[PDB]
Design an enzyme around this catalytic site. Structure first.
Site, mmCIF file in Angstrom:
data_model
loop_
_atom_site.group_PDB
_atom_site.id
_atom_site.type_symbol
_atom_site.label_atom_id
_atom_site.label_comp_id
_atom_site.label_asym_id
_atom_site.label_seq_id
_atom_site.Cartn_x
_atom_site.Cartn_y
_atom_site.Cartn_z
ATOM 1 N N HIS B 64 0.819 -1.250 -0.060
ATOM 2 C CA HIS B 64 0.040 0.104 0.046
ATOM 3 C C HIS B 64 0.759 1.130 0.055
ATOM 4 C CE1 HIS B 64 -2.544 3.000 1.956
ATOM 5 N NE2 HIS B 64 -3.508 2.389 1.283
ATOM 6 N N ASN B 155 -13.842 5.670 2.499
ATOM 7 C CA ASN B 155 -14.380 4.569 1.635
ATOM 8 C C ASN B 155 -15.626 4.283 2.153
ATOM 9 O OD1 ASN B 155 -11.702 4.931 0.010
ATOM 10 N ND2 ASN B 155 -11.079 3.205 0.843
ATOM 11 N N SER B 221 -7.368 6.554 -0.857
ATOM 12 C CA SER B 221 -6.002 6.284 -0.335
ATOM 13 C C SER B 221 -5.223 6.859 -1.458
ATOM 14 C CB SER B 221 -5.681 4.725 -0.242
ATOM 15 O OG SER B 221 -5.563 4.380 0.964
#
Ligand SMILES: [Ca+2]
Ligand SMILES: [Ca+2]
Lengths: 64, 275
Positions: B64, B155, B221
């Protein structure tokens, strides 16, 4: 199009996994400690399970 | 060859690169899961790990952090992608384990490091559904100290009349970033509320992945780093602007996309903002 499992809070991990897989067979389950900060990428087939010290679902499981 | 992810050109970064503003000497802390410093398309300036059991911040076992880092500053060469601010000084602050989670204290610790080490910009592509007095205090402290703090809005999509913005995105001291697609439509997962500040591309974002790879991710993100990168570009052009001036320019020069509840101020325009 079941994207959340309110019914599972308090259930054990093993129990939770069975209901989910039943509702969303393609689900990719991941178990994490409750009260944590997590990454903000959205994965359509992922289901994060937040558990307490007892391994019971501590928050409503939802897809993402 | 090298490819310019659409998000990068969507916010108008290239217009700045061409004028010679690429974020040189701007220190950006990616508070995440670490960064694969071995990636051929990345140059990591330093960093620190806050995860007790994982001491190397330059080891991204999640991926990530590496992806997010790529959006901020993938190198300008003839391979891979190109970050919004390819000349930026990238710092890897690992506050998340391999599983993509971290204790609130690890996050706070990272912010503390960030401040103490004079980072100019902080990117937080992370969130939790609840706040903490301590979390609030750390972000407030960062901004009082002159740091530009950007985070993913979250989200959670929409939930009736309620704001679905997560923490730390929810805090007024933070620039909370939503996700739009290549056509400037809000992504369905993008959290909404009065606390949403701006939008950035967050759908099908091509970036760097560990072990010399590239791939596309979706999420608020992915939107966040676009804004982090933009702030770096502005500071490269205007090294004397305060965090307040940076934030303002970004918020006042957006392209209006619709109702603020869903879109905050709209899509950022770094070219316009850097004016
Ligand atoms: Ca490159
Ligand atoms: Ca905010």
């Amino acid at each position: 199009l079941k994207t959340e499992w309110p019914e599972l809070v308090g259930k054990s991990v093993e129990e939770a996994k069975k209901v989910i897989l039943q509702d969303k067979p393609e689900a990719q389950i991941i178990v994490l400690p409750v009260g944590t900060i997590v990454t903000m990428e959205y994965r359509i087939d992922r289901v994060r399970l937040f558990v307490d010290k007892l391994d019971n679902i501590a928050e409503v499981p939802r897809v993402g | 060859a090298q490819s310019v992810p659409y998000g990068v050109s969507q916010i108008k970064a290239p217009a700045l690169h061409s004028q010679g503003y690429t974020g040189s000497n701007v220190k950006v802390a990616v508070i995440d899961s670490g960064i694969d410093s071995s990636h051929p398309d990345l140059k990591v300036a330093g960093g620190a790990s806050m995860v007790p059991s994982e001491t190397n911040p330059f080891q991204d076992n999640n991926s990530h952090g590496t992806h997010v880092a790529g959006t901020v500053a993938a190198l300008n060469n003839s391979i891979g992608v190109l970050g919004v601010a390819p000349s930026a000084s990238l710092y890897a602050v690992k506050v998340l384990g391999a599983d993509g989670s971290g204790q609130y204290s690890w996050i706070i610790n990272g912010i503390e490091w960030a401040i103490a080490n004079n980072m100019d910009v902080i990117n937080m592509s992370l969130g939790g559904p609840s706040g903490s007095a301590a979390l609030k205090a750390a972000v407030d402290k960062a901004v009082a100290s002159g740091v530009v703090v950007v985070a993913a809005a979250g989200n959670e999509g929409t939930s009736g009349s309620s704001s679905t913005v997560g923490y730390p995105g929810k805090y007024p001291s933070v620039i909370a970033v939503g996700a739009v697609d290549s056509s400037n439509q809000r992504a369905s997962f993008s959290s909404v509320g009065p606390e949403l500040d701006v939008m950035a591309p967050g759908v099908s974002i091509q970036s760097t992945l560990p072990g010399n790879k590239y791939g596309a991710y979706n999420g608020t993100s992915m939107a966040s780093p676009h804004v982090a990168g933009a702030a770096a570009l502005i500071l490269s052009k205007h090294p004397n602007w305060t965090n307040t001036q940076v934030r303002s320019s970004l918020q006042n020069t957006t392209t209006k996309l619709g109702d603020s509840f869903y879109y905050g101020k709209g899509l950022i325009n770094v070219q316009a903002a850097a004016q």
